[PDB]
Enzyme design. Structure first.
Site: not given
Length: 1121
Positions: A663, A672, A689, A736, A829, A1075
């Site tokens: 860059h 972004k 990168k 949940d 759960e 929900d």
RNA sequence: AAUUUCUACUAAGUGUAGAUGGGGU
């Protein structure tokens, strides 16, 4: 505080990985003295020597067994399946079999040096003597003193074979699944002697080793006498598998002989299957385990090109299932079908619905055993006891003319049709000169092509897997089984090749391959003992803010200890760890002299570096970084201590600076995050990168150990129970999943009042006071949009899984703070019970990882920001959970994580308690008439245009779970009928249904007229509108915001609960959406449990079933509100 | 698009917010 109690409980250890950068002239000095190429050389010969070690292990299997081969205890395993003994097929088998696994163990075990072959001694002396090739012997002796490297391999290859069977032992494919193919051998040959003549049996009897002069132990029946683990497994398969003489004489085994009767004259010729042997080399794991796949053209797929075995057997299984029709004449009952997860799919594929099989069996169970609550569990466990459903037995649980067998045959044949369809699309890749264009990982077309075919075959494998059963049955059709099982064995080959190419493409651009740095010393960095500074030759140095690693070598292994105190210098503090790997003293050593050594070639100082060791680092350090600095802090008084054995490795450059994505400096850098106000950045420098993987790192994996001296050690579950009993207000975090929110959290108090209901779809990262949020839900949506294209490429699903795993890491933090601020038991759960499938969010696998990371986090639960020595700080992590055992141990409570069944927690009215416990599906006119008839009173209340349906839930089916048993179902408000949606007002639609049909609703109780209706379609829509009335969760497919719940019943104040009334409010008292309701009542099912702890005795708080059945639920849910 | 390593990043300018047991088959 409930959380505070749980500290200093157990003791986990960890490995804070880090990087080291060669400071000073270390790198050049290493290179001058070639200090690392021998570590590299050995690490390239590891595999080579492993193979040689395994040759000695295979001769152990051979020779030892060759001599000691009489099947000791049970004669020659003669009583194996002879005549049922005391207890049919129970002890009859079991005991005989287990003495079997010791018959083999004794042979090995105490021999001529079990521990002389399974410890360091082998590569030092015994293996060189076993070999003779100079090259190989030298390679083995180059890997000497260096057996601390083969330690894992030793243990694996030693503890896999003992006095046990199964697993991966000799007994397994030695006496277990070996005798299944054996057994018919040394007695009543009979059936198999259809041929077996002078040109057949006598020809091969002269060809085989004449120890077995005649055939004797080969075909016949009843018992066996040879091979065992080793006599040459090939000896049995000489006729049974076929051993063509090298000269040219075609010796066709003995089964390879039947085929002249088994299939030519047609039958099943008593099995006679090829004997199984040790997995891979010596009882390893997978027989298809291979490496390779490092280059884009490394193997053009062993699948039809470089894997023709696979292609061959899809055809074979296809022919075997096309023979299913004549196997009906053979033995349709003989073919079985494993009951389990596949059984529901089988039901749908064959009959039509997923529950045909289940319910049909449940009806037959009712014939012989009787529904109620406990009866459901009786049926449940007994269906789980069934492990195979013969094909003819499944025909009995059928429908009409539906032939279960033929329907299966067709469905499973179309499955291979799918395979071949993508085999025609992969012809390009399978062509000899496949033009590779843009690599493979960047060639997404090729990725897709690969994935498609690989998964087509993988699907067939999983489908036809079931057509096996539980193996341990009785009348197994031997024309099916035997031939089919041979082909399936190979079609298990695909699994490996699929994984290989998947893992190649989903591979990162770089590589993290390391090689242990011994630096010419097998005992390198294995401890931090002050007294023994010249043994492991390593010490952590400290330049004030920096941290180092001094490693002296061969001819100067004690240099630092001579020249220490540099007085007026920077002083790289040597570690004075006087405790065992808290006495963390730090002897101020040298600076000028330390560096002198580095430059000379004596010391090899390295730098411990994390991004938080930069001076340009602006904020909160990582937890591991914190722990590291805390190891050498004064605050650590015995929490995170050293474990000893820093594994300095060496990761080389996988990438190069020149081929990284830059860059450029002074160019605006687009941001972004959609929710970033400060879009664009314009940096003064360039950013590449992955620059760390473009250089050489020296990974220092420092082992550390948290709480090795626990003070407050108690059983966690029982202590949680006690705490959740004496509390006046047990808050339950309540988590949940959900469709609209990823992990909706509804904190509920000790009375069931919603304290908070926020969706954790957004993670508001707080940096320097500014809280920039990240919609992980919108990120998920964008990532799922990438998944939408290019048929969910392998990388897109990995990115989703990794973003969901990074999300998980983020919710782990949020939940940790939620738990901390509210002292709240999570209410997750039990994932080993029922299934939430609607959730377009965290999946089962990811939630299992979530709760694993919650019980791994909950072992040392630490928030970074909190002061290290305060509770919740670095060295005071809450031990409120357990210690992850297995995924099936996550079923009851693992501390502050009650795993409660998620039954009817989301489709229940949070105001009244009404749960639709009545199946409102139009079956027949009479069914709905009895439905309509069982209502106490159906009147149209014209006042408030409503249709009251007074009902008796004590006069219905499968409704024992309820409590009030008397509800009035007013058709009121609006329903979203998702057929793709329509907002149908209840009252209006009912008025019009009744207006159309002529049912004068204006007649007081009009129930008689409703049952009076002779039109079938009346009740259809009647029952469907009744279904809508009862449906509470109502949400437009797609549009996020219409998440509302609506009750068909009024409360004590006459109001029908609306979620949209509460969604408008900020401080809603009842669920604000669908929900939210879920998490509300999951935090309430755990609330039934908490009440149970105050209803059960203290000393008895241990066996109180927290398993909330639907009858203690739908009571509390219909009675506390 | 920088990282002990991973995820999301740019997040105040060579970084930021979380998480991170890894070592051998």
């Amino acid at each position: 505080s409930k959380l505070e109690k749980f500290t200093n409980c157990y003791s986990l250890s960890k490995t804070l990985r880090f990087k080291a950068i060669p400071v000073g002239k270390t790198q050049e000095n290493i290179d001058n003295k070639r200090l690392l190429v021998e570590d590299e050389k050995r690490a390239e010969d590891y595999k080579g020597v492993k193979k040689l070690l395994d040759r000695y292990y295979l001769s152990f299997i051979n020779d030892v067994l060759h001599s000691i081969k009489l099947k000791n205890l049970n004669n020659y395993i003669s009583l194996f399946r002879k005549k049922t003994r005391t207890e049919k097929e129970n002890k009859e088998l079991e005991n005989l079999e287990i003495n079997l696994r010791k018959e083999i163990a004794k042979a090995f075990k105490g021999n001529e040096g079990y521990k002389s072959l399974f410890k360091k001694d082998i590569i030092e002396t015994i293996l060189p003597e076993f070999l003779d090739d100079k090259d190989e012997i030298a390679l083995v002796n180059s890997f000497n003193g260096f057996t601390t490297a083969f330690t894992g391999f030793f243990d694996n290859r030693e503890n896999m074979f003992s006095e046990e069977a199964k697993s991966t032992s000799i007994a397994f494919r030695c006496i277990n699944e070996n005798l299944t193919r054996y057994i018919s051998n040394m007695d009543i040959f009979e059936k198999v002697d259809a041929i077996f003549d002078k040109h057949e049996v006598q020809e091969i009897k002269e060809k085989i080793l004449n120890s077995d002069y005649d055939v004797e132990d080969f075909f016949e029946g009843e018992f066996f006498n040879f091979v065992l683990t080793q006599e040459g497994i090939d000896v049995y398969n000489a006729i049974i598998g076929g051993f063509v003489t090298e000269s040219g004489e075609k010796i066709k085994g003995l089964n390879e002989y039947i085929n002249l009767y088994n299939q030519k004259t047609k039958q099943k010729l008593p099995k006679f299957k090829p004997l199984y042997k040790q997995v891979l080399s010596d009882r390893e794991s997978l027989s298809f385990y291979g490496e390779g796949y490092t280059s884009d053209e490394e193997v053009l797929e062993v699948f039809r090109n470089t894997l023709n075995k696979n292609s061959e057997i899809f055809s074979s299984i296809k022919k075997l299932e096309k023979l299913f029709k004549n196997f009906d004449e053979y033995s349709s009952a003989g073919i079985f079908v494993k009951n389990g997860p596949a059984i529901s799919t089988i039901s749908k594929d064959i009959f039509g619905e997923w529950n045909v099989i289940r319910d049909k069996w449940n009806a037959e169970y009712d014939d012989i055993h009787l529904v109620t609550e406990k009866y459901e569990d009786d049926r449940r466990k007994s269906f789980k006891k069934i492990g195979s459903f013969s094909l003819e037995q499944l025909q009995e649980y059928a429908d009409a003319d539906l032939s279960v067998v033929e329907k299966l045959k067709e469905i499973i044949i179309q499955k291979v049709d799918e395979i071949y369809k993508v085999y025609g699309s992969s012809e390009k890749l399978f062509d000899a000169d496949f033009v590779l264009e843009k690599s493979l990982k960047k060639n997404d077309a090729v990725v897709a092509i690969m994935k498609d075919l690989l998964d087509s075959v993988k699907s067939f494998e999983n489908y036809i897997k079931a057509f096996f059963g539980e193996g341990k049955e009785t009348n197994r059709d031997e024309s099916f089984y035997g031939d089919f099982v041979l082909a399936y064995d190979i079609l298990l080959k695909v699994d490996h090749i699929y994984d290989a190419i998947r893992n190649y493409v989903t591979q990162k651009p770089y590589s993290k391959d390391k090689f242990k740095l011994y630096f010419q010393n097998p005992q390198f960095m294995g401890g931090w003992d002050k007294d023994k500074e010249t043994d492991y030759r390593a010490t952590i140095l400290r330049y004030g803010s920096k941290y180092y690693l001094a490693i002296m070598d061969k001819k100067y292994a004690k240099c630092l200890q001579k020249i220490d105190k540099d007085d007026v210098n920077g002083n790289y503090e040597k570690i004075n760890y006087k405790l065992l790997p808290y006495k963390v003293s730090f002897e101020s050593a040298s600076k000028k002299e330390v560096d002198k050594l580095v430059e000379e070639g004596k010391l090899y100082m390295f730098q411990i570096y994390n991004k938080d060791f930069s001076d340009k680092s602006h904020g909160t350090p990582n937890l591991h970084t914190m722990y590291f600095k805390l190891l050498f802090d004064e605050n650590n008084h015995g929490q995170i201590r050293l474990s000893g054995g820093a594994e300095l490795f060496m990761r080389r450059a996988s990438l190069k600076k020149e081929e990284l994505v830059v860059h450029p400096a002074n160019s605006p850098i687009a941001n972004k995050n959609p929710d970033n106000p400060k879009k664009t950045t314009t940096l003064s420098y360039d950013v590449y990168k992955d620059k760390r993987f473009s250089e050489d790192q020296y990974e220092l994996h420092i082992p550390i150990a948290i709480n090795k001296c626990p003070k407050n050690i108690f059983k966690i579950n029982t202590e949680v129970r006690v705490l959740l009993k004496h509390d006046d207000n047990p808050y339950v975090i309540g988590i949940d999943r959900g469709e609209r929110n990823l992990l909706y959290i509804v904190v509920v108090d000790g009375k069931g009042n919603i304290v908070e209901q926020y969706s954790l779809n957004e993670i508001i990262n707080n940096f320097n006071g500014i809280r920039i949020k990240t919609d992980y839900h919108s990120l998920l949506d964008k990532k799922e949009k990438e998944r939408f294209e290019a048929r969910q490429n392998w990388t897109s699903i990995e990115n989703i899984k990794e973003l969901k795993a990074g999300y998980i890491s983020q919710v782990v933090h949020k939940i940790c703070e939620l738990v901390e601020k509210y002292d709240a038991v999570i209410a997750l759960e039990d994932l080993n019970s029922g299934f939430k499938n609607s959730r377009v969010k965290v999946e089962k696998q990811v939630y299992q990882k979530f709760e694993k990371m919650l019980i791994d986090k909950l072992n040392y639960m630490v928030d970074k920001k909190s002061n290290p020595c305060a509770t919740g700080g670095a060295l005071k992590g809450y031990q409120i959970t357990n210690k992850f055992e297995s995924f099936k141990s996550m079923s009851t409570q693992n501390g502050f994580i009650f795993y409660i069944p998620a039954w009817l927690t989301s489709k229940i009215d949070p105001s009244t308690g009404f749960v639709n416990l009545l199946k409102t599906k139009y079956t027949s006119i009479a069914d709905s008439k009895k439905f309509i008839s069982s209502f106490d009173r159906i009147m149209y209340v014209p006042e408030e245009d409503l249709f009251e349906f007074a009902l008796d839930y004590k006069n219905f089916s499968r409704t024992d779970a309820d409590y009030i048993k008397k509800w009035k179902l007013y058709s009121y408000g609006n329903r979203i009928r998702i057929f793709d949606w329509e907002e149908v007002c209840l009252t209006s639609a009912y008025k019009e249904l009744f207006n159309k049909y002529g049912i004068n609703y204006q007649q007081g109780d009009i129930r008689a007229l409703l049952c009076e209706q002779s039109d079938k379609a009346f009740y259809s829509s009647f029952m469907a509108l009744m279904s809508l009335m009862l449906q509470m969760r109502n949400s437009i497919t797609g549009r996020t915001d219409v998440d509302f719940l609506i009750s068909p019943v009024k409360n004590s104040d006459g109001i029908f609960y609306d979620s949209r009334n509460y969604e408008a409010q900020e401080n809603a008292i009842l669920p604000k959406n669908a929900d939210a309701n879920g998490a509300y009542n999951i935090a309430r099912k755990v609330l039934w449990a908490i009440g149970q702890f105050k209803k059960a005795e203290d000393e008895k708080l241990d066996k109180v079933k927290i398993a909330i059945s639907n009858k203690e639920w739908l009571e509390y849910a219909q009675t506390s509100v």
